[PDB]
Amino acid sequence: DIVMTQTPLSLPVTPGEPASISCRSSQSLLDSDGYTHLSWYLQKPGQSPQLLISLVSNRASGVPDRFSGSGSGTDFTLKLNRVEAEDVGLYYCMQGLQTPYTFGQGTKVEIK
Amino acid sequence: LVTLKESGPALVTPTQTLTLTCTLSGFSLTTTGMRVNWIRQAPGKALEWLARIDYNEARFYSSSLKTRLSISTDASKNQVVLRMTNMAPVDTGTYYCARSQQHYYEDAYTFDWYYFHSRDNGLDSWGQGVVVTVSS
Amino acid sequence: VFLGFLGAAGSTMGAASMTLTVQARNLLSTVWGIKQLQARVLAVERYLRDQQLLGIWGCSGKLICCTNVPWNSSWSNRNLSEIWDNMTWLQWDKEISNYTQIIYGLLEESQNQQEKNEQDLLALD
Amino acid sequence: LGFLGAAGSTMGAASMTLTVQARNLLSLTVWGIKQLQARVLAVERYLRDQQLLGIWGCSGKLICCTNVPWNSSWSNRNLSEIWDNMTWLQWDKEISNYTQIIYGLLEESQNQQEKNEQDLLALD
Amino acid sequence: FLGFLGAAGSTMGAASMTLTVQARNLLTVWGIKQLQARVLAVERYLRDQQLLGIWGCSGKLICCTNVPWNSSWSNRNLSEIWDMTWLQWDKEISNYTQIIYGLLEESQNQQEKNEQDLLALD
Amino acid sequence: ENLWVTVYYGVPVWKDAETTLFCASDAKHNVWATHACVPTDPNPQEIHLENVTEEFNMWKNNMVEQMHTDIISLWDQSLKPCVKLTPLCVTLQCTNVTNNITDDMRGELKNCSFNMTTELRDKKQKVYSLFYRLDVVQINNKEYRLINCNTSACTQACPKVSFEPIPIHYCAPAGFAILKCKDKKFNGTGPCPSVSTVQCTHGIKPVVSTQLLLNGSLAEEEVMIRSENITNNAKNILVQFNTPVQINCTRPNNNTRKSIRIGPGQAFYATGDIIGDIRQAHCNVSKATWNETLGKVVKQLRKHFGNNTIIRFANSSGGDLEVTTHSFNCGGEFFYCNTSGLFNSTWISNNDSITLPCRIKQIINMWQRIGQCMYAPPIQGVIRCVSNITGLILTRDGGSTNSTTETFRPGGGDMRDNWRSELYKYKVVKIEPLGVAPTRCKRRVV
Amino acid sequence: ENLWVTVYYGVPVWKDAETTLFCASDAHNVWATHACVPTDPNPQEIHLENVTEEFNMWKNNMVEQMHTDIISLWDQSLKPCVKLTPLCVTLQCTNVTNNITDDMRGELKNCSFNMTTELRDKKQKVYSLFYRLDVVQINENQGNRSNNSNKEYRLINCNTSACTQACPKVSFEPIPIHYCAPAGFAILKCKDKKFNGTGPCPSVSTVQCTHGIKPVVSTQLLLNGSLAEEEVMIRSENITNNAKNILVQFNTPVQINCTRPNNNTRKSIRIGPGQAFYATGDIIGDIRQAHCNVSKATWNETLGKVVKQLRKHFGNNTIIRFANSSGGDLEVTTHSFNCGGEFFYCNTSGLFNSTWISNNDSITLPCRIKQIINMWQRIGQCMYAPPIQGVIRCVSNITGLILTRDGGSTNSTTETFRPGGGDMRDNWRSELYKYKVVKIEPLGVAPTRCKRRVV
Amino acid sequence: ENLWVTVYYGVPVWKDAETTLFCASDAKKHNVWATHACVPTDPNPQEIHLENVTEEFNMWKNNMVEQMHTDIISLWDQSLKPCVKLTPLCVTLQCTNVTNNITDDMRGELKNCSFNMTTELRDKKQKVYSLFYRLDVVQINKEYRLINCNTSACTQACPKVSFEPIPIHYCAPAGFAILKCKDKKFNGTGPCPSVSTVQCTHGIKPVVSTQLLLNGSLAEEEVMIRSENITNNAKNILVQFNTPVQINCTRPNNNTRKSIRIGPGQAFYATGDIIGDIRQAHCNVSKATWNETLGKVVKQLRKHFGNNTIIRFANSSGGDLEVTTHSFNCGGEFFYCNTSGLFNSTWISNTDSITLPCRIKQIINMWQRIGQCMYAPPIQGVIRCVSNITGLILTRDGGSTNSTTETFRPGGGDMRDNWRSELYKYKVVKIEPLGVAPTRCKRRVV
Ligand SMILES: *[C@@H]1O[C@H](CO)[C@@H](O[C@@H]2O[C@H](CO)[C@@H](O)[C@H](O)[C@H]2NC(C)=O)[C@H](O)[C@H]1NC(C)=O
Ligand SMILES: *[C@@H]1O[C@H](CO)[C@@H](O)[C@H](O)[C@H]1NC(C)=O
Ligand SMILES: *[C@@H]1O[C@H](CO)[C@@H](O)[C@H](O)[C@H]1NC(C)=O
Ligand SMILES: *[C@@H]1O[C@H](CO)[C@@H](O)[C@H](O)[C@H]1NC(C)=O
């Protein structure tokens, strides 16, 4: 299985302040067709997780514009331009290169 | 809109087979690219992908829990059933379900449905999830 | 050439034997291109088949040439005046095509024996 | 010397060398069909000229004499200025339109000679 | 009748009598192959016929000219030559063959000029 | 005291043989490839042969088969550089045609709509076209598909070439001759007392007809009947006329040709719309001339079946439309006429024109070829075409009991029967210059 | 000197040259096109005594022309057939288990894929059974699919070349063809009973056309060939060279019974307008591996005869050993041939599994059937063999082998011989061993006491 | 005193005729021109000089140039026939300008286009990208399309074959001969006083160009100007250089070639990211030698247009890029150079290098055909070639300036003038061995 590492464990930031969540993988997630498979998920407190970004940079439908992602190979960062009061929750990463899919340890976001 | 709902026993005794029924709404598993996953979440811990089933009855399970998981589905009532044998008390947690698709596109010249990649392409929708407690 | 090509077909063999130059002169004159080439090659091979058969005899370059072979009486069984004065070349072939091959074979051995006789003759002068 | 090297020479000088011109009369891709058609045309032209010569009294003869009288109105020239002063090309340009009437009479002359030889050889 | 090419192993005296059977025997992918082979065979026959027709043997398959036989060509007595074979004799005269052909051509071309001058005396 | 054999080179001796003839045209692109043919002679003079008769035999000569294969090969080669109609095999949503549809054309024309690709393969377009009922089949407003979809896709006919039959001449190569007959009382087979030799045959029109001979030659004396075995009803009866009648085949539908861009460079010419009135295509032939022509057929046909017999003309026996209807082509449009009004009469032993309903088919498969085929583009404007009926192809019925009531129906077995009616006098032959004859001549030896 | 030159046209003389030999058949089968001229009913074989001709193989042009002609004939036969271009799709295959056996476990795949119908807008889902040697997994990643999971596969020729499919109305039977020489050329047949690969033939006899040459295609064992006269023969360009194929010809044949016990069913789907793809239907009955049966005693006696003939070219005290193929692709490492339209790839390891010391029962050869065949060691011109309904049986005559000497030994020890077969020209070299085309020269000069008479 | 007509065979008499010439080349992988199947040439060609003969040579009417044009067209089409067709490339391309190390002159010349292409599988596609030049792409309404998309689809040239102009020789068949004019001062039309026959002509390079005769034959002693009508402004007046000038054409962009699986077994060689900086292709011609050659040209033109008449060389007069730009092939890629810098001067009586900007096109129409085009694949590496220009194809301008200020501008869109600049010394004649002449000799009666 591909071990996924997520840094940092907790990200306490003030509203309106940019934040970034780093992520790594044991091996490269580049498919033979040239597509890098990696997705980000947000789990609100008391709600089921929802998809944020897919294929590293493609944004999900209905998700806010502030969410963005980048990276290639074995390094992926989830850059957030502005952190709102509703964006607090647990952020999870996922690799879709091969089964079984492994999630990261999570990144709790709490207001300062 | 596409919605998913899960159901099963909330309190399960140890060493008993646990079954989970997932109801699909707004879509069907008979589509050329649909697939339903199964991800569980322990209280205060990270998520864990358990198993998934494709449209062509392709079943995929986890490496550590291959001998305990068993997924199946039927096109009659449009439901997905996941079976888990030999439940341990450490397996207590919220069990969710998800939806993913290969994103098949139709060509304009020929009328063949093609695709760019053969993977999950992100988990679009997620279920509400049920709380399964393993205790005596 | 006033009679034209094949104009002496219905005439007698005596009158048609003096106009054999027109018939001999008329012997030469994609998928369509390949069939046209095949037709031309077939005409060339048909001309060479008769020309070499007439050349192996003592009639290489003569239209009316005689041979040193006695005519078998059983082939015709009739007179000579009635052949060259009322009979045509078309009806004569029907009477000689039954054994024309044997006549042709004879015309070959006679030329071979005449040629070896000439070869043995040219030895001292 | 060489093919056609005697073209600029006189009629009498060019008549001495004729085998050098007689030997050169035979010698998926489009090249195959092109060369095949050209080979067929060349052998057909050689065969046509050879048979045209064979119907006359010259069978395989380069210098062939004929008993046909020469019409003075065809050229109105003597033997000295046409064999020691002019070439073959200049002679061809003078009887270019008089060749068919000479070729036609040659065939009938040979046809009469053949029947005269056949009838004489039959009487004995 | 030994048959086509059947007198190859015999001597020159026996092979020279039955050579007419060999002289008269000289005359989609398959379509083009057949056409090319037929064209090659036709041109291969006419060439030899002309080399012969150029000399005084246009319609004579057995002829003897007046060109002097250079002894250098063979340097071999005549009685034993007629009775080796043609196969055993062709490999030796091979080098002198082109010389012989040229000599024959020259002699015929002259002979024709001599007969032309001979017919001019009357 | 005897004779000696003397060979002659150039004797006039013929032998029947098969030889591939070569074309000859006046050289005035064409569907018969006039450019890829040797030009004809300005005056192919004939050589009349006296005191000789030749045994002619029809239905067995290789000239008709050679011409049939040549016509098929020329038709395929002239159609090869055209564009292919492979993307046209899709679902067509067709509806009936509006704008005062007549009773005869009721349901015979459909307004089909389908999805086709533009010059870019990643973009579609919704185009519509008018297709006849004979060119479409229902799929079980309803969905329709072309009749050539389960078989092979048909190439469209390049508008640059024309379907006008250019008269071609067949000539025999070196070493062969084509003898021709010249007597007026020429039978089907047998000997001909007036045989002539000509280098090239006359202008043969490569017309394609299945029931009535069109634009052919005329008899010089009277109507003649030709058949392999007149007593056998299985063989077709070839009839030719001495005075032809005129047929007036028109197409009153004033249609507009619409070009549809189906791919890069290639274009599909579809029937845009009927700007004018809608009416059924028909052919007009005078009743008096047809009645007189039929009166001449019975007079020259009763000699083979008796004078007291009664003959009856019936329509086609039944089967496919392309073999039961009079099919031809005028200006690019293929017609299929119902000749039930012509062959409908009874003959006893002793306003003024007949209309014939004709159908129009675009996807036609000429000859008996099934896989290969062609799509005929619609010709804009009113089509006008007049021609001469120079012959018929009849077929008798079985039984033939009580030696009367001989029913005659039109035939149409193969296209060869058309060219057989034109090449009836000509016959190829092979000449043999070698000749053997005895005389008193003896070759002198040295 | 009183000797002068004389010319003779018609002299019998020979010369080596290259010409385009045309064919002749006894007379749809478009593989031969049936347009070739028929052979004569009485082939005249003129014996040519008192003459010896130097015959030499491995450089003769008749085998090269036959190879090029059969390649052109194969291309012409496959030219009007239906192309299999739309078959390159993602095939959802799985292993078959309906009455499967232990030896055929995983050798047959039950594939499912989308196919086009006669209409372009509509598509159909067809099912076909492809062999394991004709499919390759597309996405080999994302592993751990359930033991019974539909893995995604694709044809082997998809990434090389979309080739055609063999038409069912034609047959690949080896119809004998006779190569005739044109005018001005002759074919010399060496009728020597003990003729060796290169040398002067004592008894030579000309002929207008060769005998019936069946264009059989094989790689290791020569099937349906011409046997020897009295003793088996072994030929090679250089017997001391290990890089040359050692051709072997037998004098008596060994009966080989090849069969396919699977009761195959053929289903026809309309891949497009007028074009049809004959797919493999449901198998009726049990599934068993195709094989070939060879008699043990007959093969052992034939091997002993070959060993006896191998003791004269080398030392007769040398140990002759037989091993299987070294390796490589299945086209050369296995005995590949055609049997009733079905291509077989037999494992001949059991045949060459013996050693010889200078002092009923039968063996089963496991064969595998492949549908994609390049057929001439090509890289972009293959063909698809349609399935044949019912069982398939074949009775052939293995008349020879194509051995390859394994060099590197010393002191005349452990001389091993392995079967080989490179170019397909070696298969026809054992059949055209007696023929050699020659160009005749009817012109010749000689001396005689003659002179041209002055007239 | 008596004369008798005699027949002579093998006379040296020839007549002008038309025939198909052979193929001949050295025995020195594939080629777009005559492949290995061509007949090899002899290492020692025979050249027999002929005296006392003045043959009337005449170019622009001989069938040698027409036959060469026809077989060159046939060879080009035959070579492009088995190659992969680029018909599925007609898709919308989302192009954008390239800015990686761009220059001031190459701005907008190259477009970085991305499109959805089909892979080897029928039910799968790939998102590939390629660099296309601005001259072969057109806007649709960022979305672009190929210039050949609305016309006939182009066939991608196979990389195995090469466009190198390997010299070929046109051998005459049997019975025909090739006459070479040995006169050094021989113009287009006139009787050549020194004509020498030859079995096969010299090496004619099948190089195609539009304004400059590249790798042509040099004049023997001085620049010669040939034209059908020296007084007409039309007819494409061409010149020949006695000495060659060097031209260095190169593509400094270090281009790369990437393979895209367009279909099963078909590969579309596209353009990847170039390595290094970008730069415009150019051709370098030395100003000194070009000015000297231009000085020889005006000197050779003044003898035909009269003395003390100032002449002016200016650039093309308009039209498409094929006639307005100097097009040729260098290494495999096709160039289109702006030759305005060369023909730009005014020569008045009594009197370091020039760079030419070039453009490279991938989708071209080599000949004057719209239905046949070919996509040249991009070759990797730096292209550099040195050649010789041995002639120009000039065109005059009409005017009534009293024979003053004669403006000469290049042109000549026809390829047959390029081909004729080498075949001017040769002509085809038909040998007539039959001849009749009278002599005093009579055939004896035997
Ligand atoms: C160059 O070619 C020209 C024609 O372009 C030749 O001009 C000839 O000039 C004479 C002068 O008396 C005229 O009678 C002829 O009619 C012209 N010929 C033609 C074909 O028009 C000129 O002779 C040629 N120069 C050389 C040196 O050969
Ligand atoms: C054979 O040849 C030799 C050498 O020329 C000669 O001496 C000898 O006499 C000849 N023999 C006969 C029998 O003629
Ligand atoms: C169209 O015509 C068909 C017969 O061709 C008929 O069955 C159908 O009812 C008609 N439809 C309409 C809407 O008139
Ligand atoms: C691309 O370059 C062209 C040509 O200079 C220019 O007109 C156009 O605006 C440019 N486009 C962009 C997006 O820079």
Numbering used by the authors:
A (entry chain L): 1 to 27, 27A, 27B, 27C, 27D, 27E, 28 to 107
B (entry chain H): 1 to 35, 35A, 35B, 36 to 82, 82A, 82B, 82C, 83 to 100, ...
C (entry chain C): 518 to 546, 569 to 664
D (entry chain B): 520 to 546, 568 to 664
E (entry chain A): 519 to 545, 569 to 624, 626 to 664
F (entry chain E): 32 to 59, 66 to 141, 150 to 185, 188 to 309, 312 to 321, 321A, 322 to 398, 411 to 506
G (entry chain F): 32 to 58, 66 to 141, 150 to 187, 187A, 187B, 187C, 187D, 187E, ...
H (entry chain G): 32 to 59, 65 to 141, 150 to 185, 189 to 309, 312 to 321, 321A, 322 to 399, 412 to 506
From the manuscript:
Here, we report 11 lineages of V2 apex–neutralizing antibodies from simian-human immunodeficiency virus (SHIV)-infected rhesus macaques and determine cryo-EM structures for 9. Envelope complex structures revealed eight different antibody classes (one multi-donor) and the complete repertoire of all five possible recognition topologies, recapitulating canonical human modes of apex insertion and C-strand hydrogen bonding. Despite this diversity in recognition, all rhesus–V2 apex antibodies were derived from reading frame two of the DH3-15*01 gene. On the negative side, to penetrate the apical glycan shield of Env and bind underlying conserved positively charged residues, broadly neutralizing V2 apex antibodies must contain heavy chain third complementarity-determining regions (HCDR3s) that are exceptionally long, anionic, and often tyrosine sulfated.
The cryo-EM structures of V031-a.01, 6561-a.01, and 40591-a.01 (determined with molecular reconstructions at 3.1-Å, 4.1-Å, and 4.2-Å resolution, respectively) revealed modes of V2 apex recognition similar to human broadly neutralizing antibody CAP256–VRC26.25. A single Fab of all three rhesus antibodies bound asymmetrically to the trimer C3 axis with an extended HCDR3 that penetrated between the N160 glycans of two adjacent protomers. The V031-a.01 complex revealed the mainchain of Y100jHCDR3 to make two parallel strand hydrogen bonds with the mainchain carbonyl and amide of Env residues 167 and 168, respectively, while a string of aromatic residue sidechains (Y100iHCDR3, Y100jHCDR3, and F100kHCDR3) stabilized the extended aliphatic chains of C-strand residues K168, K169, and K171 (top). Further, heavy chain residue E100aHCDR3 was positioned such that it could form a salt bridge with K169 from the C strand on the right-adjacent protomer in a manner similar to VRC26.25. Additional C strand interactions with the primary protomer were made by the V031-a.01 light chain: Y30LCDR1 hydrogen bonded with K171, and D28LCDR1 formed a salt bridge with K168. The V031-a.01 sulfated Y100dHCDR3 residue was positioned such that a salt bridge could be formed with a single R166 while mediating cation–π interactions with R166 from a second protomer (bottom). V031-a.01 also inserted two additional anionic residues (D100bHCDR3 and D100gHCDR3) that formed salt bridges with K169 from two separate protomers; D100gHCDR3 could also interact with the third R166 residue. The structure of the V031-a.01 HCDR3 tip was most similar to CAP256–VRC26.25, whereas the inserted aromatic residues of 6561-a.01 and 40591-a.01 were ∼7- and ∼9-Å shallower than VRC26.25, respectively. For both V031-a.01 and 6561-a.01, the germline-coded Tyr at position six was retained and bore the posttranslational sulfation.
